[PDB]
Every structure is written in structure tokens, then in C-alpha cells.
Design an enzyme around this catalytic site. Sequence first.
Site, mmCIF file in Angstrom:
data_model
loop_
_atom_site.group_PDB
_atom_site.id
_atom_site.type_symbol
_atom_site.label_atom_id
_atom_site.label_comp_id
_atom_site.label_asym_id
_atom_site.label_seq_id
_atom_site.Cartn_x
_atom_site.Cartn_y
_atom_site.Cartn_z
ATOM 1 N N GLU A 256 0.797 -1.209 0.000
ATOM 2 C CA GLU A 256 0.000 0.000 0.000
ATOM 3 C C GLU A 256 0.845 1.282 0.000
ATOM 4 O O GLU A 256 0.795 2.163 0.877
ATOM 5 C CB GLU A 256 -0.956 -0.049 1.217
ATOM 6 C CG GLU A 256 -1.900 -1.235 1.004
ATOM 7 C CD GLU A 256 -2.891 -1.324 2.120
ATOM 8 O OE1 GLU A 256 -2.549 -1.427 3.263
ATOM 9 O OE2 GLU A 256 -4.150 -1.425 1.767
ATOM 10 N N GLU A 332 -3.705 -10.641 -0.189
ATOM 11 C CA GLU A 332 -4.586 -10.624 0.986
ATOM 12 C C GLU A 332 -5.964 -10.995 0.530
ATOM 13 O O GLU A 332 -6.394 -10.492 -0.515
ATOM 14 C CB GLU A 332 -4.698 -9.217 1.594
ATOM 15 C CG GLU A 332 -3.272 -8.771 2.055
ATOM 16 C CD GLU A 332 -3.125 -7.339 2.548
ATOM 17 O OE1 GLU A 332 -2.041 -6.769 2.637
ATOM 18 O OE2 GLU A 332 -4.251 -6.808 2.989
#
Lengths: 409, 204
Positions: A256, A332
Amino acid sequence: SGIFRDVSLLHKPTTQISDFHVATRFNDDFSRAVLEAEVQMCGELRDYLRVTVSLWQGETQVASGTAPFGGEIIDERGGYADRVTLRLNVENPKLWSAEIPNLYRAVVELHTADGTLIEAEACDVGFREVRIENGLLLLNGKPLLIRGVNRHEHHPLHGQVMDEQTMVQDILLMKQNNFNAVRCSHYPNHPLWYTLCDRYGLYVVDEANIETNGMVPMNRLTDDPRWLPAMSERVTRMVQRDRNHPSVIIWSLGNESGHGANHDALYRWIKSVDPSRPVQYEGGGADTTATDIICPMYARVDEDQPFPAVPKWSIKKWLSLPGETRPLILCEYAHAMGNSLGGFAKYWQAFRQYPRLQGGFVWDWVDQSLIKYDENGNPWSAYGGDFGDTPNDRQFCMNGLVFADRTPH
Amino acid sequence: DEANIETNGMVPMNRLTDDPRWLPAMSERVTRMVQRDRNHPSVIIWSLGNESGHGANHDALYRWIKSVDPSRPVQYEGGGADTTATDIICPMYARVDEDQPFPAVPKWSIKKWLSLPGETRPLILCEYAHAMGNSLGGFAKYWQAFRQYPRLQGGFVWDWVDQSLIKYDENGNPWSAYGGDFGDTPNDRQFCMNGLVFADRTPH
Ligand SMILES: [Mg+2]
Ligand SMILES: [Mg+2]
Ligand code: NA
Ligand code: NA
Ligand code: NA
Ligand code: NA
């Protein structure tokens, strides 16, 4: 914050082994391998120095090579006179995998030719090849199916301090629950973790400590050349430290942080320095030029989520977008927050059905709850804001398959 | 536009198509079609025929076409729908989500087929949604997938019109006949009626 990992004192000789890299290459059916170990020294360079690398299977020495320093000519100015590469042939090597974590021991001896050991370093070696071919991630020539989980280093009493017992406990439970892989969300782990995944057998995604999620837009720093140096260190020093561990099978650029030119540069650096492992990175839409693997977070099985710029396509549709050929492994998925994991089976059915759908890493292993004590002195599980902390994100820190004390959900 | 070549009844299916003594005869069925219809704008794709397995004669003719008329892709379903003789994955009756792993010529779910390792071509079913009798069950399922997947570019439903023939009873009234109704045997009974419309054009 704090000094939360080990502190140690190391004595090395003035003439010493300053780095060493171990690689294992194979023939077509893995019946033959060559172990190559590049060793660098610092200090007093003299003709009498030698390096001996020996490889052991248990108490048996299976191979050995000795050579003086001075690597091959590399350019017009010559070669590395302070380096040497030993190549050992190994027949019918016992291969490493998470299924059978076969290991050998390589001992790296720096010594005088006449016999004085100066110092020795060593590591566990796992003969395995990792490569992506025809759109598939293969391990020892066979396509993996990653039953992964993301695992933060968290202890309800000790915070981010890790200890052997705890790590062991987590690895046992992971294995007992049919996990074969772990992603170091989102930074390099305490060193013993790797030793343990090498020995117990878990495939590992080793991840640089780079996350700038809160920037707006998210790649504001990662696309900025002035942050290239700080980011470089996070990637380079990780690879320099963990490159000889067989458990690490994939390197990740961080998490991220959007998609910045710094990521492109670093992706390339790793690919040059370590061709043995694919590089992945989810930022900027999960299929950018900085990733060998389509590695989305929370893309659904059948349902598209067409956000602008960084859509999360259904994983089945993503694999076949015009021109796409890479394998897809979710970095994820299946956010295990509270009463959750609804729809888990849908993922597994797709993974088994589509070759290029090679699995994913559940988010995440253990709730990040911390123990607090009530008036009576009885412990209770606390989350965001329970320490006066604000702003905070409340229970969003608890997303684990297991409670902070390792009790399963 | 599809060459008049179908040897479905051979065992195995490509017994003649892989035989060079049948290359000449096959070649004329392909080349003469191209010579005739190549100026028509409506023809967008050439097809090497149907249900003739996959033999080397197909590969030879596929290249011939690509060579004389680069303007239109070449397709052919035989031998597994994704052979070297086709520019388009063009299966018949492959399902949307369900795999039918027959040996040698499996019919993968179309969504999965697109993404098999190394595959990059578009997929347009040469036949799907067999409309025999009270049928077309699950038709929406194909359309939802074609719209969601760029490379799933549609298909050709099987088929337009029932092949029934008119017969007349004692009083002279007409009736719709199928396989075996003319004393033909062996025959395949009602399998000749798979259309969206009846023989007379009334819709089903
Ligand atoms: Mg808040
Ligand atoms: Mg019959
Ligand atoms: Na798979
Ligand atoms: Na969280
Ligand atoms: Na489409
Ligand atoms: Na029919």
C-alpha cells in the site's frame, strides 16, 4: 517504538567473510544440481588465502570445493580480487519444499591454504528452484497452490517483540491447519522466523518495510526520486540479509504505497541481483510493471469491483484480460475480522479449478489485541482507542484467524 | 464461411484429415470456397469445416488461407477447439462454469479456457445452447459471461431452424416428420430438430 529486537556483539577477524550468497541450479528433472557460493572478503588480501565450501547432509559431507580468491574477469579493469565463487556438483539432491523441508548445511571456511581456519560462517541450504513459466509459479517444476496467511509480529503482552516460543507456536498451528505459506506483512521479520520456516517448511514472501498508505495520492512518495534512496535501502538491505534462506520464495516491494517509478527501479534491481525469485507488489492496481504476479488484495471470486484506476476484477476474469499472462496469487483475501470467512469455500473452488489461480494469503493470522488490566487486576483484550489513542481505528486491528493468545477463532 | 468438409463418422475422427492422400480433395473444398466468396464483406472469418478431428491437412489448409487472404481470421473447432489450425478458441457446447474434461479433447468451462497457461486467443463458441425441443435453459448464463469477459466474444447458437420435413396423412393433411419417418434406418430420430424456429419459420 523502542529496541524491540535482539541486541548482540559480534567479533570478526580483521580478514573476514563479509558476505556470501548461495544459489542452487538444476538440470531438467532435478536429478542433478550445482550449488554455487560466491564469497566476498574484507581485510588482508594475500595469495595464501582460500575459501573452502563444504556441503553436508547430516554428518555426511556430500561435496566440497576449495579455491583461492580472485573471481573471473568482469570488465576492462579486471575482476573482484576479493571474491571467489565455488561450484559444487550435487547428484540426486534431496529437494526442499514446504511439504518435505529437506535441508543440507553449507559451511563457508576462510582459511590459509596450509590449513589455518581464520573463521567460518554457514547456513542451511534448501535445494529448490522457483520460477514462473508459461504463466505459472512453479517450485521444483511443479505448480504451487498457496495456502497462505499474512502474519504480523504481535504478542498481547509484549507488543511487537517476538520470541521463539511464540513463533514456534504459530508455525505449528499454521501447519496443523493446512497452511503452507506465510507473507511477512509488511516488513522483514525477526531473523529466527526464517530459520524456522526453513526448518519446519513454509513458503515465505519476504517484504520490504515500505508502506505509505496514508499519502494522497498513495504513490506521492514512491513516485518521488527524492525518496528513492530511503526506499532503496529498505529493499536492498532486506535482500542482502535474507537471500540465502530457502523458505523465502518471493520478494515483495512493500505494501500500500501506490505505484511509483521508485518501485520500477527497485523491482529491476532485485531482478538483476537475484534471479532466483519472482518479485511481486500489489500497489497501484496489483498487475503493474513492478510485479511478476497479479497479487490483488480482496478481489472477489466472481464479482468485479471496477474502481477507477485500480479496479479489483473478479480473479477469474483478471487472468484473461487481453494480453495478461501472469499467475494470480492474492496477497490478501478473506478478511477474518470478527465473525467472518463467509465465502471462503468459493475461493478454494476457483483456485482448484483454474491453473493460474494459485492461491492467496488470508488476512490475517492473529488479532492485534493488547492486554489491559481492570481495577480488580483482571486482564481484558483491548483494541484501538483503548489507550487514549486518537484518532484511532477501533477494532480494525483485530482481523485474525486466532485470538492474540493463539486460541482459535 | 465454412468449407464443405465433415468426416464426423470416421474412427478416430481425423482418420481422413490426417491422411495426405485426402489432402487434395480437402484442399479443393477450401480453396474453391475462398476463390468464390473472398470479395464479400459479410464474410469475416473462414472456417476449415466441421467435426473432422484435427489432422495435418487442416494445418496445411489453415496456412494456405492465411497466406492468400490475410484479411480474415481462420477458425476450426476439430481436435479440441484450440489447435494450431485455429485463430479463435471456438468450442462447441463448452459450458460457462462447468468443465467437461473429456480425454484428449476436453471441453473446459469457457471462462477457464481463456486463461489456460500460455493461451491468449479470443473465444467465440462455434455452437452453443442446443435449442432442441423445450430448451435454451441457462442461456442467460452465457450472456452474462460474454459481457463480463472481454475475450469471451459470443457464439453461434445451435441452431436456427428445425430440419423437419412435411409428410401427409391419409386425409392428405400435412405433418412434421423427423428421422426414421421415411423408412430410413438406421436414423437419429428427432435429433434433426434443434432450431429456434419450426421448419415453417414460426418461432419456438
Ligand atoms: Mg476513528
Ligand atoms: Mg437410431
Ligand atoms: Na489453481
Ligand atoms: Na486491520
Ligand atoms: Na466479452
Ligand atoms: Na442435430
